[PDB]
Design a protein around this nucleic acid. Structure first.
Ligand SMILES: [Mg+2]
Ligand SMILES: [Mg+2]
Ligand SMILES: [Mg+2]
Ligand SMILES: [Mg+2]
Ligand SMILES: [Mg+2]
Ligand SMILES: [Mg+2]
Ligand SMILES: [Mg+2]
Ligand SMILES: [Mg+2]
Ligand SMILES: [Mg+2]
Ligand SMILES: [Mg+2]
Ligand SMILES: [Mg+2]
Ligand SMILES: [Mg+2]
Ligand SMILES: [Mg+2]
Ligand SMILES: [Mg+2]
Ligand SMILES: [Mg+2]
Ligand SMILES: [Mg+2]
Ligand SMILES: [Mg+2]
Ligand SMILES: [Mg+2]
Ligand SMILES: [Mg+2]
Ligand SMILES: [Mg+2]
Lengths: 97, 203, 175, 205
RNA sequence: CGCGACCUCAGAUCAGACGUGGCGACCCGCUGAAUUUAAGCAUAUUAGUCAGCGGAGGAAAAGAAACUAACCAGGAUUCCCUCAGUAACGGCGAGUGAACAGGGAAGAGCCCAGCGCCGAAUCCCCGCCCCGCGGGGCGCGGGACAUGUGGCGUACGGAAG
RNA sequence: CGGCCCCCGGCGCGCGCCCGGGUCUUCCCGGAGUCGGGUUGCUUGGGAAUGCAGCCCAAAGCGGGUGGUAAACUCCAUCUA
């Protein structure tokens, strides 16, 4: 039975779920730019904070590496994504025998 | 085909392949003068996405500014007022150094029109920009009507009224709840509309 | 080196792009022939190289390029630095040549910066293969060797003579 | 300075208000200017109606005004695609188009679609050459009029759902008491904490 | 040793063209007090104003969301009435103080870098001819810009083959 | 109300341009010392910092920003700088 507040809040209308707009297609997978970036990483090299964060994530401590990335770039979620990216680069390059 | 590679190589500007070229260019530009005509853009992708096209009438000025905040020009650090304003050492000048470079380029050449500008260098003191200038009286710019907006006399000296990219970014205007201080037009227009004591015939 | 560069220019001289004069000549001639004689397909395939970094990067990404000629004297090096590694990872052979003006004079322009051999004639495939074999011997097969080596780091000759004089003094002291 | 029992007053007159006094002495002047502007538009521009484009049925976003209704801005591209015409072709027909307006409700979707069908039925267009595509003869003596006033359809349409005659019914009248609102309020305030205690009851074995 | 090409450049009373300065009631960018109030005075208020400096147009600015909202959702910018002397700021003292709704005038939307495709199909200049009133363009023949990237097709509301 | 002279607009003979809609398949899909973080000044009603700016650190691509009390986890709405 419908009412104002609670769990099923508001007037009951039917949904109109369709395909989203093109503006959601902003930062997606994009295999061509993935090829561009994955080439140019080993074209250029790495930043100095990245080069010592790979050492701190290799031998010293993952928590200390996350704290160093949190100090060098902006926020905690940025530190999480940068830590996962550096760990993926580490395990993909320096573990292939 | 190439400009995305140029962009992505410019993005990570701390890597070893870029910082060598950046240090060499900063030395090369520090040993130059303050305001001079670079014959071609050193950043073609950034210049083209700001509005450079390789044709007759677009002029790149390389310009050097001095870093740091401003010192209040009062003599001997004396303000002669309340203790709100004795801070002679620290005022930080609400326009950016990129806007200062645009002002200096357009005021050195008022015959040109400042379109945009972009960073090319820094060491500790001298910040280096390149400013693109449109020539409003060349025939290739007075034709091609995607460019004829800057020929019209309402765009004379955009750099000193605050119409360029760095000018708007220094004014701080945008749609949102973060910009109620300048709700429309400018912050002085907002001050005008919010302190105009409105009266009417019938009250 | 200059022998292989002379062979490369002798190959590239006959795949020259058309200038404005012979361009207008071919346009007027083919237009008059298709107006009078009404020819459907007078030209089967025009063989001509490609110039420009935006064109050459597209051709090596789509694997249309048979050979890449990369100029040396480009003053922003960032415009060119991605091309050797990109041609290496796409398997297209590239040769680094000295002098962009000599590459512009085979395209009727001041600077050319890049030349892509994509389509070859029938009587030129052997010469192109003979060039590509030496170019892959020099550049492509040694890419892991070039990528490790650092360049520069040469002191001034007065300081080198000073260090060599001190080294001879040290060897005289030790012997 | 203060006095007997009166309200504490804080007027905002410490700032130099005497310079910026905008008094509407030109208020009949602006009225005559804007009358002549609208009349000059209706004369010189077109036999298009005044307040030209058609506005949508739109509900107001609040807990306050959402019972009411409003003439919106444009016809919300999915609605215009269901009506089946091109974007700028609609803009030249006279359809107001807003590319930002989304669609959540099939009710409002079909409402704007039927409003588009009504406008396309009421449309009488005149092409340039007299070959007559999508028209006929001089219909209704060139429609007997060439100017409409205050919206084409009067886009308010305050709906009157009456539902008057009914008999009081069974135990719903003994079931819909006051306690439903308090139970829903307590359930909304204590939804997630009960889920946390259920997760802890499943966790602690 | 010399010649040539590119690139950084300098000179001229070189051919052509452009900015200076004035007014400044309205507008834009920076800067910037103190008298006054707080019955005293430092934070505060006066005020993001007066003064100073730089710019243009009959309007300028802003302007097509990195928006508002949190429900049956709206939908560029400006202006008025409301919101409201409210939320909030403040030796929480003096005082300062918006916004989203909502109703109205106006209603107009768009383009470019990237992505590739088009044999640079693009543009400036020079000279003679087709020619018009009070004046300037579609074609013809060669000197440049441009492949380190012109123009068409294209713009996040999807586009292209 | 009437006559003359002067100026601007919208009808109708030539010169120059001229392919959109729907179904299916394939492919493309984005603005960087920039956002953001720390710190310091000015400003705001904007408070665990509304905006601007100096110095330092400085990105991502199921990304980034916003969601008005700082922080972590999670879900959702909206936008695409
Ligand atoms: Mg996303
Ligand atoms: Mg030039
Ligand atoms: Mg503007
Ligand atoms: Mg009264
Ligand atoms: Mg008394
Ligand atoms: Mg006063
Ligand atoms: Mg002046
Ligand atoms: Mg007193
Ligand atoms: Mg005193
Ligand atoms: Mg103040
Ligand atoms: Mg003044
Ligand atoms: Mg004037
Ligand atoms: Mg947009
Ligand atoms: Mg009230
Ligand atoms: Mg008070
Ligand atoms: Mg104030
Ligand atoms: Mg994020
Ligand atoms: Mg987010
Ligand atoms: Mg939240
Ligand atoms: Mg919160």
């Amino acid at each position: 039975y419908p009412m104002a507040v609670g769990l099923n809040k508001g007037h009951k209308v039917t949904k109109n779920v369709s395909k989203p707009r093109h503006s959601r297609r902003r930062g997606r997978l994009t295999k061509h730019t993935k090829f561009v970036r994955d080439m140019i990483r080993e074209v250029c090299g790495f930043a100095p904070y990245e080069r010592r964060a790979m050492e701190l994530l290799k031998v010293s401590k993952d928590k200390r590496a996350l704290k160093f990335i949190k100090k060098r770039v902006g926020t905690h979620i940025r530190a999480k994504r940068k830590r996962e990216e550096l760990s993926n680069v580490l395990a993909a390059m320096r573990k292939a025998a | 085909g190439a400009y995305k590679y140029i962009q992505e190589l410019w993005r990570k500007k701390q890597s070893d392949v870029m910082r060598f070229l950046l240090r060499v260019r900063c030395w090369q530009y520090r040993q130059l003068s303050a305001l001079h005509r670079a014959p071609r853009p050193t950043r073609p992708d950034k210049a083209r996405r700001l509005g450079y096209k390789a044709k007759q009438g677009y002029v790149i000025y390389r310009i050097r500014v001095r870093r740091g905040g401003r010192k209040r020009p009062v003599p001997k650090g004396a303000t002669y007022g309340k203790p709100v304003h004795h801070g002679v050492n620290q005022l930080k000048f609400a326009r950016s150094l990129q806007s200062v470079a645009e002002e200096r380029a357009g005021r050195h050449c008022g015959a040109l029109r400042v379109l945009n500008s972009y960073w090319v260098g820094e060491d500790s003191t001298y910040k280096f920009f390149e400013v693109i200038l449109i020539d409003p009286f060349h025939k290739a710019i007075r034709r091609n009507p995607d460019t004829q907006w800057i020929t019209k006399p309402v765009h004379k000296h955009r750099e000193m009224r605050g119409l360029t990219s760095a000018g708007r970014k220094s004014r701080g205007l945008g749609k949102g709840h973060k910009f109620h201080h300048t709700i429309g037009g400018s912050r002085r227009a907002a001050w005008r509309r919010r302190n105009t004591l409105q009266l009417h015939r019938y009250r | 080196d200059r022998q292989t560069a002379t062979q490369l220019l002798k190959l590239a001289h006959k795949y020259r792009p058309e200038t404005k004069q012979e361009k207008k000549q071919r346009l007027l001639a083919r237009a008059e022939k298709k107006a009078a004689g009404k020819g459907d397909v007078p030209t089967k395939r025009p063989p001509v190289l490609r110039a420009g970094v935006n064109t050459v990067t597209t051709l090596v990404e789509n694997k249309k390029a048979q050979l890449v000629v990369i100029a040396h004297d480009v003053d922003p090096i960032e415009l060119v630095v991605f091309l050797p590694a990109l041609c290496r990872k796409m398997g297209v052979p590239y040769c680094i040549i000295k002098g962009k003006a000599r590459l512009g004079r085979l395209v009727h322009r001041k600077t050319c910066t890049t030349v892509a051999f994509t389509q070859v004639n029938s009587e030129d495939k052997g010469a192109l293969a003979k060039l590509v074999e030496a170019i892959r011997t020099n550049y492509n097969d040694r890419y892991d060797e070039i990528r490790r080596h650092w360049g520069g780091n040469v002191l001034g000759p007065k300081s080198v003579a000073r260090i060599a004089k001190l080294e001879k003094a040290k060897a005289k002291e030790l012997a | 300075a203060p006095s007997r029992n009166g309200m504490v007053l804080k007027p905002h007159f410490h700032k130099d208000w005497q310079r910026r006094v905008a008094t509407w002495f030109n208020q009949p002047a602006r009225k005559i200017r804007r009358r002549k502007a609208r009349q000059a538009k209706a004369r010189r521009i077109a036999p298009r109606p005044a307040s030209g484009p058609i506005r949508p049925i739109v509900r107001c976003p609040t807990v306050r005004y959402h019972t009411k209704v409003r003439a919106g801005r444009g016809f919300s591209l999915e609605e215009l695609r269901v009506a089946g015409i091109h974007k700028k072709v609609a803009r030249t027909i006279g359809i107001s188009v807003d590319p930002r307006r989304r669609n959540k409700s099939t009710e409002s979707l079909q409402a704007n679609v039927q409003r588009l069908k009504e406008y396309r039925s009421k449309l009488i267009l005149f092409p340039r050459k007299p070959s007559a595509p999508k028209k006929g003869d001089s219909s209704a003596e060139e429609l007997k009029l060439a100017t409409q006033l205050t919206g084409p359809v009067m886009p308010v349409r305050n709906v009157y759902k009456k539902e008057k005659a009914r008999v009081i019914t069974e135990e719903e009248k003994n079931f819909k008491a006051f306690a439903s609102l308090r139970m829903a309020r307590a359930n909304a305030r204590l939804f997630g904490i009960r889920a946390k205690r259920a997760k802890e009851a499943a966790e602690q074995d």
